[PDB]
Symmetry: D2
Subunit: 360 residues, 4 copies
């Protein structure tokens, strides 16, 4: 039997491992059983965010020394997905996923799987090469989680690469053309291609509907559970599949809904209910809320104009994260929840998936 | 005669967009001679170097001057123009136009919306954030209450103020004249102007006694605050402009105002309390909203309900910008509409980390 | 006979008309003879910069009341080109171009001449495409005639204001069944600037028409003008053109010269521009009326092989950084940060560089 | 006691890039045991929430610990790590590595490059920007002068310091402990830490007499400044780290250091004067530059040579970011290379609006 435990840990800085160390030193976490850490780090969440790599380096160092292995082996063994940007009231934190085998005694309970893709050349980001390799890795992660029914996947969290000026120019020197000649926009193509990879692997969209031309163009194509995030600190995709399976002894469950837009508090309440939280009094059973946020391509929300796509000072994914975190925070009474910005092919245009991990 | 207040919340396409107001004037719904105040959300950064505020006022004053056949200077002496910059997150730029009609009709039964306007003298740079600004604002708030025909401060539900700030040029001029300003920082000067102005509201309304207010308490003693003050700072003016909004027995308005106080930036309960205080008791009655007006800020503790955030540590985005995005998103999620008024920096306006929130609603 | 006088006026804010009013009230400027005003306004110089429109509105309202005509007529008569972004030490200011008819003879040789022309408004789906290139080229030739300049070699600076795309305008284009050149408001500024600059190069013979296509715009950096200076704004829907050069039929006591900065730190090009304008030593720097230059981040992400972060910085857009850098370089050569520097130099000088002109007293 | 200093300016591809240093170590050009200090330009925002500084130090400490077979803790006690954030404009990220070893050499002709290092104790938040930091820094500067074998302060040409700052959480902790900090503003706290640290340099070197320094003068009396101090603040440390750079008769280095003082942000003449003071007398000798190190800042007057700028009014971009872009561009245009060290915020470092500038050059 598979047992998943999940710990939401406040952090004081990107390199703060003290909260995790406390759980390890007390015996609550066996570090050998950590399979994934999903972080909100307090950089800008865009191209030049180095808090993501700083956080991964610090955690890999700490765990490597606790486990007596190399940092390189830790990163091959544990998924480190650091989502930058803690705008508004969003509280920096890490979510640690622990998976234990115990033979013990109902229904379906939380299950997790992890998979990594190969490194991508710069000219492969945002194109079918990334779509198809991610799709394979998602199936790989589903099996690792022992989930056979794609309907039982409630959240697929991915970290994916981006283009820097340096990588674009290197591609230029090698005679290769990149999907887009813009560092910030490259994040959208990488996020969206990865998300279409989830939809492809999960059967949400048929392969004949996906092409290079549809990536970041056909917003009718999206996954209802995909959550993708981009960073300078890696060259491949890291996959975490989270769902429920009948062969689990976890005392946790995951549910989800889809925010129709950035202010869709109803979808937050629907996600809570799908995870078994039916009243405000049961709010303390939340382990974490995980959601995608984005600026709608129309430049409006419910017929009302906003400046997210016109604001040259603050990039739109920063604003979307602040908004959606505030909406969730106002429903659950806690701003320490995971919100990642840029939801290309993840929920509808201007919306995004939202999942809740809760105590049973 | 009898006062009837009508309020129009008008979407804008840019700071200088007067088209929505012009449509209401051209259709006969607004007599421009009866406009008494315009409260705007303009899409600049809402901080020191926000010129969308002055651009919006200039555009409105030009337009109204030409419609009325008077000079822009006379319009500005007659009509309050309070432009609150910063439309972060999903917050929708718009203006709220306050029209006051004299009508030979009976007052409505009970108390209905009433509005009053008053302007203070200009302040010297060295007076911002100090008792001179507190006491002059308090005097003007009482004048605006009289203008609104509100004698009981308990019937005042929102006092909206525009106040000045310090630029580097004004600080340096003060230094040459041998004067010390309250703070040698342009962005922080907004907080002192906002806070002194808010304490002036609290003093005028009896929310705080005069003996508790001193220069040393301004922007320091957060136990002192008004539950209805809403203050906003700008480079585009040198005085304080005051709009008092409340209810009066001597009003024929088909509108009312209610309010509550957000205890913190994510206090959706306070939004629902303000709606209820304005007579909106269910989600179906939210179509009676004319506007929601709220103050937002980063708490001095650097936390919300024990959870850290970076608003006070973020050197890229100033904290009033972040607070506005948050509180607008919270309100928008309750009412289903991000076109509501949210202003940042709530010194002495509600508790530390919170702020007053009012609702103007149709009866 | 034409005489051009040029006044560089410090401003205290985008709406500050006091310095211009002082020159009018002192008798130094007849407002009826103003033909163009080129401003540096202290907004962010990107998409959501409303200081540009605030400055034009304030200047048009002031001049309309001084002249006893409508604001609409002022805007039809006078070019208002407000370049946002005053980063670093760059000092906000306006440069006012006055053109007088004089009976004096022709000054021996060539002296400053200015011409102005406007294009029609463009639909959003036209920005960054050949329609903008070709309409700009037509207007540049008209402005050359207005300036009485027949030889393109005597054109030393072609300053343009051009439109941009906002989310709402993109949505309008979509609603009308049209696709825009790019679905990014900030990037739309580059396409508008670049198409406009290629229009200058076409009109002046710097590039042949058969080399220009929609695909080349903002892609083939071998195609550029050595005198074009283009600037984009939400506050207008057309292109406004100011051609500045020298003409034999000018009685101006000023001349214009120029060079091309090869990169953002090319102080040699600043000195070369000064020398081309007759300023041969540091002591003659007092003859400067203004220096006008284009600045940009190179697509390579480097300057002389050294990496910089301008194209990777998600907090500060690259045209803001380039303006701060090039203004500082010029300021250090001429001893004055109140010079005109505009960012985003697509097809204006080489990739990573831009034209630089000097207006100087003879 | 003859000492030889070698200095290596190394381009970096990211804050954590150690590859250039590893190349010099692997080729035998640098014995890692002889590294005494690393001075970095890291590509974060250079303000409060810049974590590239700590990322760079952590990466360098890890790498050196593994190369030397010691713990990271010992590396940090052994090697000064001063990471100056902010690579605005064309400023190129890089590190400058200082190697120092004893050598059996004869007396050099004249004086040659010398370096000394010293660390202060950790400071309480309430000690930053006050005499406790001034006096402790002065003590450490004198210690570093001894480490460098420089007895005459006129032979000190650059004193580079990393110092702490205040975050919201540290301010709130101080408040909970009943303590008042020098300023209740995270960004402004950097200026007080930088300025107090610079005054400590001036005190140690005899540039200013002790009786002129008090808490009230810190960040207020701009007549008081050091001509060689260069201070930089960061969240990643709680003490001050000091690198003294000068020339000594007891040096066998093939390098020298010279300096001047930029009177304002566009003072290219001072750049050429610093080059000349380092023995570089013509453009043809420019290839002898190892690095140029300079301080930059926005003048409190809000102007440069009487011309207004917006650095102190700009609520979007903090003034130290703008000053760094400007001064780096000025230097780059003189020397033809933007990979030079420029640090922003020059409180008590050169005049108001200016700052020291040093050149390390091959003989
Ligand atoms: Ca989506
Ligand atoms: Ca408050
Ligand atoms: Ca160019
Ligand atoms: Ca200084």
């Amino acid at each position: 039997m598979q047992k998943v435990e999940v710990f939401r840990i406040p952090t004081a800085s990107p390199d703060d491992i003290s909260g995790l160390a406390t759980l390890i030193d007390s015996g609550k976490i066996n570090p050998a059983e950590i399979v994934a850490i999903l972080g909100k780090t307090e950089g800008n969440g865009c191209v030049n965010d180095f808090t993501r790599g700083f956080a991964t380096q610090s955690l890999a160092m700490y765990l490597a020394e606790k486990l007596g292995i190399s940092r390189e082996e830790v990163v091959k063994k544990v998924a480190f997905i650091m989502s930058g940007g803690t705008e508004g009231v969003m509280t920096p934190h890490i979510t640690v996923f622990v998976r234990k085998d115990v033979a013990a005694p109902p229904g379906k309970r939380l299950a997790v799987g992890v998979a990594f893709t190969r490194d991508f050349l710069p000219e492969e980001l945002g194109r079918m090469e990334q779509v198809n390799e991610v799709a394979r890795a998602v199936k790989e992660a589903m099996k690792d989680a022992q989930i056979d029914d794609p309907r039982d996947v409630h959240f697929v969290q991915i970290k994916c690469p981006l283009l820097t000026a340096e990588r674009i120019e290197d591609a230029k020197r090698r005679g290769k053309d990149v999907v887009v000649n813009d560092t910030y926009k490259s994040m959208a193509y990488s996020r969206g291609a990865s998300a279409l990879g989830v939809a492809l692997a999960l059967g949400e969209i048929s392969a004949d509907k996906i092409s290079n031309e549809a990536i970041c163009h056909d917003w009718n194509l999206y996954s209802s559970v995909a959550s993708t995030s981009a960073g300078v600190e890696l060259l491949n995709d890291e996959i975490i599949v989270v769902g429920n399976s009948t062969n689990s002894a976890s005392d946790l469950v995951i549910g989800h809904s889809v925010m129709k837009d950035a202010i869709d508090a109803d979808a937050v309440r629907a996600a809570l209910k799908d995870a078994g939280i039916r009243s405000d009094d049961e709010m303390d059973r939340i382990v974490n809320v995980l959601a995608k946020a984005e600026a709608a391509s129309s430049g409006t929300v419910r017929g009302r104009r906003n400046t997210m796509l016109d604001d040259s000072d603050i990039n739109h994914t920063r604003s979307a994260r602040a908004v959606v975190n505030a909406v969730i925070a106002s429903v659950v009474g806690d701003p320490m929840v995971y919100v990642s910005g840029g939801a290309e092919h993840q929920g509808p245009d201007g919306g995004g998936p939202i999942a809740v991990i809760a105590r049973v």
